């Protein structure tokens, strides 16, 4: 009875569509129509960070807003002091095709990973002093696209085998495995409370997961192409996605709907990175046209354009205190704006 | 008074840069290759975990070959990593289902990608003995063979059928039909004919890489 299951699934998705179209009593634009506009926002490159030989695929801020890690496909992790533009560490990797890097909230660990299907975990605060590898977590089938810590003992990884995983670093084992994406899972973002996370794959679908119940809660559609970036809203009741269809979209977790699209007629390049401000009123987005637009989140108006990279920007991150935004790009340069 | 704390930072950074310079000079002295192919294509014959790494040295020049082992057949997200390589080695079984047209479609997609516009291809058309012994024993799958005539640059070895030459030159022209329609001097195509066992392929990759680097330099000076 394959056809019966097909028609059951279609009846179910039509019931979901009916349940969603009854809760859209008004649009976000109709409610934020009277808010005063944010004003044109102009940032400047405070610091430019040089030292990487090749393209930068990943950066992650530290939780103290000074230290910053970056990954280059020449095979080096570098931890920078952004206030002084000093390289605090420089870690040689074993496989050069790094594609993700993360920073532990405690500050004693850094995780890399890429086309080797392994997530390595480096110890920065070691008894001797030089940065060695603590664990190499094998067990994925495809490349490692993202990874985020939870504590110094847990880490969630996203992969090209259509699977997210939860790891226990002391054992090297896979606690929970997350299944459901039919395409390569390209991004993650943890909630502020570390009880959920949302992932976006190359099937135009974002899914919400329960880290302790190990199950998928809601599924969000609306994009027309692959989802490259996901960032949570500052309170954990929304998130924003970037796609290859040159649009960002804003979804709600309690309405189970999409609220806003951030698109322009002169934008035909895909989106790489996404970030919210500390207030959540601006949405920063990096594009393949080497720029970074700054949107009004409560509206759909562009408040500024960060210009200055001469290749594909692939990385964004706003600090925990909200002082700076840091961009990396395929021109092997990091920039800090303010 | 914490210049005590800042001079230590400057010293650590100085040591990091003096090592990064050595890493730079060993990075830019090495060439990187992406071995790409299909199943049953002879990609493993040329070699003789998501990434397999092969290191070798021809004429005191260090090459670094990579082969994607444990990845799925999606390719549109991890092939963007292998821009900024010298060449993409592309292996094709030139001999059930049409694998020749599929290799053609893959070559077309690699050629016209927005990020691989600057990367060139060393085309290896494998399995020439099989092609020969099948043509003496192609028109069903490609209707323009009976229309096709052997090129003026036909240079077979002494002892060759005039009809196997035509098959292999037809396949080469079918790849050059794609590589010629776009690019106009940012990336190139280096087609070659290889059998099962022959050791000239390493020297061929060496020569093609020399040509690629020379063209890069002549383009920096705006002479090409």
């Amino acid at each position, epitope marked *: 009875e394959l056809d019966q299951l097909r028609q059951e699934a279609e009846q179910l*998705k039509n019931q979901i569509r009916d349940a969603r179209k009854a809760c859209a009593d008004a649009t976000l634009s109709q409610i934020t129509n009277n808010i005063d506009p944010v004003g044109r926002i102009q940032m400047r490159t405070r610091r430019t960070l040089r030292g990487h030989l090749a393209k930068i695929y990943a950066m992650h801020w530290g939780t103290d807003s000074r230290l910053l890690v970056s990954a280059s496909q020449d095979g080096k992790l570098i931890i920078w002091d952004s206030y002084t533009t000093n390289k605090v560490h420089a870690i040689p990797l074993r496989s050069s095709w790094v594609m993700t890097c993360a920073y532990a909230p405690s500050g004693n660990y850094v995780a890399c990973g890429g086309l080797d299907n392994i997530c390595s975990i480096y110890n920065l605060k070691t008894r001797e002093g030089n940065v060695r590898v603590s664990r190499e977590l094998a067990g994925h089938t495809g490349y490692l696209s993202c990874c985020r810590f939870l504590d110094d003992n847990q880490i969630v990884t996203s992969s090209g085998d259509t699977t997210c995983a939860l790891w226990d670093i002391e054992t090297g084992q896979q606690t929970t495995t997350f299944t459901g994406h039919t395409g390569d899972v390209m991004s993650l973002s943890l909630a502020p409370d570390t009880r959920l996370f949302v992932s976006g794959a190359c099937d135009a679908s974002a899914k919400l997961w329960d880290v302790r119940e190990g199950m998928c809660r809601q599924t969000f559609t609306g994009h027309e192409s692959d989802i490259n970036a996901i960032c949570f809203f500052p309170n954990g009741n929304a998130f924003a996605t970037g796609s*290859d269809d040159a649009t960002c979209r804003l979804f709600d977790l309690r309405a189970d709907q999409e609220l806003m699209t951030y698109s322009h007629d002169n934008i035909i390049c*895909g989106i790489t990175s996404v970030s919210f401000s500390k207030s959540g009123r601006l949405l920063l987005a990096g594009y393949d046209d080497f720029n970074c637009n700054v949107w009004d989140a409560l509206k759909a108006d562009r408040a500024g354009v960060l210009a200055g990279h001469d290749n594909r920007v692939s990385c964004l991150g706003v600090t925990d205190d909200g002082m700076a935004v840091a961009t990396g790009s395929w021109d092997s340069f990091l920039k800090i704006w303010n | 008074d914490q210049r005590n704390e800042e001079k230590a930072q400057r010293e650590a950074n100085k040591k990091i840069e003096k090592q990064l310079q050595k890493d730079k000079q060993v990075y830019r002295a090495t060439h990187r290759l992406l071995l790409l192919g299909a199943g049953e294509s002879g990609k493993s014959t040329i070699v003789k975990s998501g990434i397999f790494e092969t290191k070798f040295q021809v004429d005191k020049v260090n090459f670094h070959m990579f082969d994607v082992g444990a990845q799925r057949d*999606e390719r549109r997200k991890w092939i963007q990593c292998f821009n900024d390589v010298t060449a993409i080695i592309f292996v094709v079984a030139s001999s059930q289902t049409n694998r020749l047209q599929a290799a053609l479609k893959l070559f077309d997609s690699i050629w016209n990608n927005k990020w691989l516009r600057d990367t060139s291809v060393i085309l290896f058309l494998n399995k020439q003995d099989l092609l020969a012994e099948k043509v003496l024993a192609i028109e069903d799958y490609f209707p323009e063979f009976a229309r096709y005539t052997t090129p003026e640059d036909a240079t077979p070895e002494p002892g060759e059928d005039p009809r196997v030459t035509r098959a292999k030159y037809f396949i080469r022209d079918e790849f050059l039909r794609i590589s010629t329609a776009s690019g106009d001097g940012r990336h190139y195509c280096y087609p070659h004919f290889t059998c099962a066992v022959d050791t000239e392929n390493i020297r061929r990759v060496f020569n093609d890489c020399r040509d690629i680097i020379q063209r890069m330099h002549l383009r920096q000076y705006e002479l090409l």
Partner: nanobody
Amino acid sequence: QVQLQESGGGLVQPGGSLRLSCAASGFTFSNYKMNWVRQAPGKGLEWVSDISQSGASISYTGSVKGRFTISRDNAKNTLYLQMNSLKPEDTAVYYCARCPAPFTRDCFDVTSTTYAYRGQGTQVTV
């Protein structure tokens, strides 16, 4: 949601004809390049025909040139295939595949076993 549903398959006397159709929903049909793939019983997914954003460039595989015809109707969001002079070697389930990203001259992984922007198929048995 991206949705592609094909229609028109059936049993055809060898030498007959069919007109397959593909309705698309969830995206701007005019920004993409569209495809037809094919899965014969016991064999892999092969490629039949593409068409550009405006139907200017059209490519066919070798064993369908002169017989098949592709066409778009961007206002009606429908893609077509006209199969003429059918052979027993054409018995396969036919899909309507869409290239992943818009405005791109290339598109990659259409004949993959797990491809997202592909319909569920329709059966033609000559």
